[PDB]
Chain length 49, copies 2
Amino acid sequence: DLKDLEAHIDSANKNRDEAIKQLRKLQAQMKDCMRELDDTRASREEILA
Amino acid sequence: DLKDLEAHIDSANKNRDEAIKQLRKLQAQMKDCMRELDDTRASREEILA
């Protein structure tokens, strides 16, 4: 049980890394989309107008 | 130590929940920006023409 919980801790930490890894990639992707959406909405709305 | 491992699993799972909670709010914003960019892509590509 100790080794099972120890291995489970690695799986729990590994599972947390998966969600954290996606958050890191999603954050970089969201920031790029948010930054682009800011310049695009500020430029496209002006260039299209 | 077995009971102590449960705290690490709870703490590790708690940290993953925090990242998942923040990722959920950020993942939704990323998809929202893509929708505006997609709508602006066709418009900027056609309105500019």
